[PDB]
């Protein structure tokens, strides 16, 4: 009382026998518990947050006395609203602590005295784990009661007779109760169980309070939704539930997804509402976010939830497979024509204008069609580059995967066209170069149906994975041995293309003798027997070289074969399915989807009307099932 | 495993614990394992040196992944261990 340290110690001790009678001093000496001297300058904590931080088995009976004294002081609103000015913490009004210590009674007292229930806990502690915090819950007392499995606290905060805590309220980030409740979720059992249960509870209650709009539509700053947020962050449990949710009571039935269409005994035509799994590109979809985004953690399992897999199947069977074969055959024909036109190129460049006869007209047709295909591919590449869905969520395929291959191909064709107009020797060498790259693109095709060859995954790994550094160290080893042995062997013309085979340290350029020995060892045979010529140390060294090379390379490569074959598991067909989905979706994105080629529609109004996505029509996808129940 | 994950409640015998508790903020627990004897900076033999350098142990891996040992090696890696 006389000083802050003893007051903090007394409140922490949790004994009110020592707290009686000092209120008389506080009133007489105009001391108010809200005054600055009672809050440590580091953060700004008051006595009440300390008492709640030092709860004794959820029973600190001094708290009512503290509230009575505070209201006696005449300052009670500022007493509760006690932000922690520090950076590590923030906001953190006593209500947050009370909700967090799993005690409802002190929360009831706090609200009864008018405890603010919108104190944004905008502290560095409360940012998600990535942003350096430890626990993100939505920066809100209601979102804090919701994240940490407190159904009673959220119930009370929803219908408290005093100042209400409207669920629709959102934090600085825009994450409302449901966004945050998805932010804390995981793929475990208990966490998914309680998060799904409380998600349903919160959504139903908010819909009942405000039937005008669905709570789930309230986007965050990034513009996503709880379903989209679970898709982007990779939350399998919440995503599965929110995509397979049906509600019975009519007043809250309009916010379902898995409607029921009809049953005829053991057959059920379950109508999944994909109002937001595909928007024809109008607004970001859950399928695009789920599959195009390569940073997801559970991409496959989520891609096989239920409406997603059947949706991809239906897209495949309808402008998904026919168009793929059309494009693959068209590209193969374009590559064939490129090969023919390059091969039949006028001898040694010399680009004339001779197109008068039939064969010459055929060559001209090949050249023009090759140019047309190249320019079309460049147009596609630039359209993809300019079309960006959202900053942070976009293809951004430059210097990655295979779009760069198409870009390079077009660049090479254009440069070749320019130099062909110039007609310069030793410059059309990129034409042929273009062609090689062209056919490498054919390798990245064949990623559709019929259990395509897994080349992709290998070439996708071997490009920038352990094999690269393995061959680098192998080259270092062999070149070190080459230097060693050429140094050992270093000590009349001989009529040889390289200057001399040693011959008393003739030397010239290291590369010459280095490549001589490199090709000798690569070919392996032809030996070097001779006579005497310094001791057996050289032959010993070379035999260790050959033995270790052969044995270790064979054994390690074959063990790597075993490792990859035991590693190319259902994960491999997961890659196949992901490639198939990407093919379907970029095919659709290529041409206008919103044309009359979309996914089926459904009910118009009333039973099938809702404000979740698209008009009351609620574009729905029906999947059939049979259950003997 | 037990002797490296021992915590004792009663205060008179609580000073001889290893896995203290630092703070909790709901579902987050910052468990403070006391490695008073898993590393002595070479002053006195440590449990990590004995455990890993000694090649005659029978369960060397499983013991090396108990809980404080694995995270301790991770932290050493991320700090003058990898660079």
């Amino acid at each position: 009382v006389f000083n802050r340290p003893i007051l903090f110690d007394i409140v922490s001790r949790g004994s009110t026998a020592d707290l009686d009678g000092l209120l008389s001093f506080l009133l007489t000496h105009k001391k108010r518990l809200t005054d600055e001297e009672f809050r440590e300058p580091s953060t700004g904590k008051t006595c009440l947050p300390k008492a709640l931080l030092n709860l004794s088995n959820g029973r600190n009976d001094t708290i009512p006395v503290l509230l009575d004294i505070a209201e006696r002081t005449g300052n009670m609103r500022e007493f509760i609203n006690s932000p922690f000015r520090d950076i590590y913490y923030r906001g953190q009004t006593s209500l947050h602590i009370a909700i967090e210590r799993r005690c409802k009674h002190y929360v009831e007292l706090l609200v009864a005295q008018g405890a603010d229930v919108h104190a944004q806990a905008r502290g560095r502690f409360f940012q998600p784990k990535d942003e350096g915090g430890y626990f993100y819950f939505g920066e809100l007392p209601l979102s804090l009661a919701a994240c940490t499995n407190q159904p009673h606290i959220v119930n009370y905060l929803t219908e408290n007779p005093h100042k209400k805590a409207d669920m629709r309220r959102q934090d600085s980030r825009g994450n409302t109760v449901l966004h945050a409740l998805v932010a804390i979720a995981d793929n475990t059992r208990e966490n998914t169980k309680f998060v799904t249960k409380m998600y349903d509870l919160l959504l139903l209650k908010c819909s009942r309070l405000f039937p005008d709009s669905n709570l789930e539509t309230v986007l965050n700053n990034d513009g996503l939704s709880p379903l989209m947020m679970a898709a982007k962050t990779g939350k399998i449990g919440v995503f599965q539930h929110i995509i397979r949710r049906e509600v019975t009571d009519e007043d809250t039935r309009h916010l379902s997804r898995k409607f029921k269409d009809w049953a005829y005994g053991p057959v059920y035509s379950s109508l999944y509402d994909l109002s937001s799994l595909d928007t024809c590109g109008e607004e970001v979809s859950v399928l695009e976010i789920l599959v195009y985004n390569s940073k997801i953690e559970n991409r496959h399992e989520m891609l096989a939830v239920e409406p997603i897999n059947e949706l991809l199947r239906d897209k495949w069977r309808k402008f998904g497979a026919v168009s793929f074969y059309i494009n693959v055959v068209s590209y193969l024909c374009a590559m064939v024509i490129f090969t023919l036109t390059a091969y039949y190129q006028p001898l040694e460049g010399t680009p004339p204008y001779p197109y008068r006869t039939t064969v010459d007209y055929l060559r001209l047709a090949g050249e023009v069609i090759t140019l047309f295909t190249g320019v079309l591919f460049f147009f596609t590449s630039i359209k993809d580059l300019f079309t960006k869905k959202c900053p942070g969520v976009n293809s951004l395929f430059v210097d990655g995967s295979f779009q760069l291959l198409y870009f390079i191909y077009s660049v090479l064709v254009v440069v070749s066209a320019a130099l062909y107009l110039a007609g310069i020797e030793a410059y059309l060498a990129v034409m042929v170069f273009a062609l090689v790259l062209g056919w490498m693109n054919a390798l990245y095709f064949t990623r559709g149906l019929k259990l395509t060859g897994t080349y992709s995954i290998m070439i996708q790994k071997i490009l920038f994975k352990d094999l690269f550094r393995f061959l680098l160290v192998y080259l270092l080893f062999m070149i070190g041995y080459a230097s060693a042995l050429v140094t050992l062997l270093n000590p009349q013309s001989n009529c040889t293309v390289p200057t001399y085979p040693a011959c008393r340290d003739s030397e010239t350029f290291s590369a010459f003798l280095l490549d001589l020995f490199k090709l000798t060892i690569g070919m392996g045979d032809l030996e070097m027997l001779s006579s005497a010529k310094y001791p057996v140390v050289f032959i010993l060294l070379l035999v260790t070289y050959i033995i270790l090379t052969f044995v270790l390379l064979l054994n390690m490569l074959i063990a790597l074969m075993g490792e990859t074959v035991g590693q190319v598991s259902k994960e491999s067909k997961h890659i196949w399915k992901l490639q198939w989905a990407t093919t379907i979706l970029d095919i659709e994105r290529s041409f206008p989807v919103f044309l009359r080629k979309a996914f089926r529609s459904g009910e118009m109004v009333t039973v099938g009307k809702s404000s979740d996505g698209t008009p009351d029509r609620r574009w729905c996808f029906r999947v059939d099932e049979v259950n003997w129940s």
Side-chain angles (χ1 to χ4, degrees), chain A:
Chain A
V1 190
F2 312 135
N3 60 69
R4 171 252 291 165
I6 62 172
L7 177 56
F8 277 32
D9 164 26
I10 288 159
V11 295
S12 54
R13 201 191 308 119
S15 179
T16 186
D18 290 326
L19 281 164
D20 55 356
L22 62 85
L23 75 168
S24 52
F25 157 80
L26 295 170
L27 301 167
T28 304
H29 193 196
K30 64 94 171 176
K31 314 290 283 181
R32 314 172 82 171
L33 220 60
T34 58
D35 198 333
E36 53 257 32
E37 59 259 13
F38 306 104
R39 304 152 64 200
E40 66 184 3
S42 173
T43 67
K45 301 160 49 50
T46 318
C47 328
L48 170 42
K50 175 53 62 170
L52 268 295
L53 271 163
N54 300 163
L55 282 180
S56 62
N57 192 2
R59 277 274 80 96
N60 273 27
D61 296 326
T62 188
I63 294 157
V65 164
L66 266 300
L67 272 296
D68 294 26
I69 293 170
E71 57 81 18
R72 286 295 169 76
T73 70
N75 195 2
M76 200 254 269
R77 295 296 309 174
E78 176 40 49
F79 176 51
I80 303 280
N81 174 337
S82 50
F84 299 11
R85 306 171 287 100
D86 51 355
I87 191 192
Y88 187 50
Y89 282 24
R90 203 82 55 90
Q92 257 275 19
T93 67
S94 181
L95 178 46
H96 296 237
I97 304 288
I99 301 155
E100 196 153 5
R101 282 300 172 91
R102 307 272 195 146
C103 188
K104 148 166 55 58
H105 325 88
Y106 298 123
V107 181
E108 274 159 10
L109 296 182
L110 274 165
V111 196
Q113 269 90 27
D116 184 11
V117 292
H118 293 274
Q120 295 302 324
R122 194 184 303 98
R124 281 300 326 286
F125 191 86
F126 308 142
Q127 309 304 334
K129 278 197 169 296
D130 70 351
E131 298 208 52
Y134 296 80
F135 191 61
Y136 180 44
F137 51 62
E139 314 172 355
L140 194 84
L142 203 159
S143 81
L144 176 46
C147 286
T148 77
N149 183 11
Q150 280 290 312
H152 298 295
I153 305 291
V154 69
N155 282 344
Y156 174 71
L157 278 148
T158 41
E159 60 264 18
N160 54 351
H162 318 279
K163 192 222 301 203
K164 282 255 184 158
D166 60 342
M167 312 220 210
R168 298 154 306 103
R169 173 73 95 89
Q170 62 183 355
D171 82 0
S172 313
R173 308 264 276 287
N175 307 48
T176 178
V177 183
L178 315 163
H179 289 238
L181 178 49
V182 166
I184 61 138
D186 274 338
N187 321 315
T188 75
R189 175 63 266 177
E190 56 185 10
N191 170 224
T192 47
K193 184 65 202 68
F194 94 76
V195 71
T196 279
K197 195 155 201 314
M198 182 150 305
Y199 185 41
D200 275 354
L201 175 148
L202 286 165
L203 188 42
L204 298 178
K205 286 220 301 186
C206 186
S207 57
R208 290 181 199 282
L209 264 72
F210 313 76
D212 290 332
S213 173
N214 180 346
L215 178 58
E216 173 176 322
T217 60
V218 181
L219 308 175
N220 74 343
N221 274 355
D222 298 337
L224 312 182
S225 306
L227 160 63
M228 276 169 241
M229 184 158 174
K232 193 184 70 56
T233 314
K235 309 282 168 44
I236 180 48
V238 184
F239 175 74
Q240 196 165 353
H241 153 78
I242 173 58
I243 206 63
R244 307 177 311 159
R245 183 188 49 212
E246 69 295 10
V247 165
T248 302
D249 39 346
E250 176 52 69
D251 194 355
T252 62
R253 175 160 142 110
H254 57 286
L255 52 85
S256 283
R257 300 286 272 222
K258 176 192 180 175
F259 293 97
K260 280 285 294 305
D261 202 46
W262 49 250
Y264 194 66
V267 62
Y268 305 149
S269 168
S270 209
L271 181 68
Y272 284 102
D273 171 329
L274 52 87
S275 292
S276 170
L277 306 187
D278 283 319
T279 70
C280 300
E282 305 149 7
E283 314 92 19
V284 64
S285 87
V286 174
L287 199 53
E288 301 177 18
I289 286 166
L290 162 46
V291 66
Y292 274 173
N293 206 0
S294 284
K295 301 92 193 167
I296 311 306
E297 288 78 300
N298 278 318
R299 211 175 312 90
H300 179 221
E301 297 93 12
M302 304 184 357
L303 264 168
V305 47
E306 182 39 80
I308 303 299
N309 193 19
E310 265 271 355
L311 179 49
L312 295 182
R313 294 276 168 77
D314 169 56
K315 288 172 162 291
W316 190 232
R317 297 176 62 271
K318 186 183 66 53
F319 333 122
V322 168
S323 183
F324 168 61
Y325 298 162
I326 287 305
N327 189 7
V328 79
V329 163
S330 165
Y331 179 76
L332 286 197
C333 283
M335 260 307 99
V336 161
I337 291 170
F338 187 43
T339 286
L340 268 284
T341 293
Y343 163 81
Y344 278 100
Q345 167 167 220
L347 310 180
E348 207 165 359
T350 53
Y353 307 152
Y355 48 93
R356 283 92 178 94
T357 178
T358 59
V359 64
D360 211 345
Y361 194 75
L362 180 136
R363 286 145 47 183
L364 168 65
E367 213 285 332
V368 59
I369 189 163
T370 311
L371 291 184
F372 183 58
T373 55
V375 71
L376 276 184
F377 293 9
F378 201 77
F379 177 72
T380 294
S381 299
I382 61 181
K383 283 297 295 181
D384 294 1
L385 288 164
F386 299 148
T387 52
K388 313 189 177 179
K389 286 287 185 184
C390 182
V393 168
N394 186 21
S395 60
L396 305 174
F397 264 50
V398 288
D399 203 9
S401 179
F402 73 87
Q403 192 273 335
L404 67 84
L405 297 177
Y406 288 75
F407 191 67
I408 289 298
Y409 171 98
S410 176
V411 169
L412 296 199
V413 169
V414 170
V415 171
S416 284
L419 292 172
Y420 178 95
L421 188 61
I424 311 179
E425 280 76 30
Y427 284 0
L428 274 277
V430 301
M431 214 85 166
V432 60
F433 214 91
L435 197 149
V436 51
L437 208 64
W439 277 96
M440 318 268 274
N441 300 333
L443 164 154
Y444 280 157
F445 276 23
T446 315
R447 53 163 167 175
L449 189 56
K450 312 300 183 204
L451 298 173
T452 56
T454 37
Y455 324 120
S456 184
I457 79 159
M458 283 81 78
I459 206 179
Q460 185 51 250
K461 297 176 301 200
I462 300 302
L463 185 66
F464 198 71
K465 291 286 180 182
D466 301 327
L467 178 149
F468 181 74
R469 56 183 60 92
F470 143 73
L471 61 72
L472 282 189
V473 298
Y474 190 10
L475 291 193
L476 264 295
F477 182 74
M478 62 78 78
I479 195 167
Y481 268 176
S483 174
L485 298 204
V486 302
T487 319
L488 190 157
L489 193 48
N490 212 350
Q492 198 265 324
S493 312
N494 313 309
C495 305
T496 294
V497 179
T499 51
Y500 280 159
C503 178
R504 69 167 67 78
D505 305 313
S506 180
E507 289 277 330
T508 295
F509 202 100
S510 62
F512 264 99
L513 191 54
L514 168 53
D515 64 56
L516 170 151
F517 216 103
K518 143 65 195 169
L519 61 91
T520 61
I521 60 178
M523 192 305 287
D525 212 1
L526 189 140
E527 286 83 2
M528 181 155 307
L529 180 58
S530 81
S531 73
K533 297 294 293 299
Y534 60 69
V536 297
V537 302
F538 181 88
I539 175 53
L540 265 189
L541 196 164
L542 166 60
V543 67
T544 88
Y545 159 66
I546 192 66
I547 287 168
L548 73 90
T549 300
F550 149 49
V551 170
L552 165 142
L553 269 297
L554 184 62
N555 187 15
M556 72 84 87
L557 202 64
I558 216 80
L560 184 53
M561 151 213 100
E563 183 276 327
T564 194
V565 301
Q567 165 268 301
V568 298
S569 306
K570 332 309 156 289
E571 66 86 20
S572 63
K573 65 95 166 174
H574 305 352
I575 303 302
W576 167 78
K577 273 192 170 63
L578 200 162
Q579 293 293 292
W580 166 38
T582 40
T583 46
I584 300 166
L585 292 159
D586 57 11
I587 292 156
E588 306 289 352
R589 191 73 181 82
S590 65
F591 55 89
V593 190
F594 27 67
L595 310 175
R596 311 305 180 88
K597 40 190 73 168
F599 43 69
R600 100 172 291 286
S601 173
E603 178 56 34
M604 272 307 323
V605 73
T606 309
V607 168
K609 82 169 162 189
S610 186
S611 63
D612 178 16
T614 72
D616 43 359
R617 197 183 49 265
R618 294 208 80 176
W619 261 350
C620 286
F621 194 64
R622 61 172 58 253
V623 58
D624 298 9
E625 304 174 355
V626 296
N627 213 9
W628 314 96
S629 181

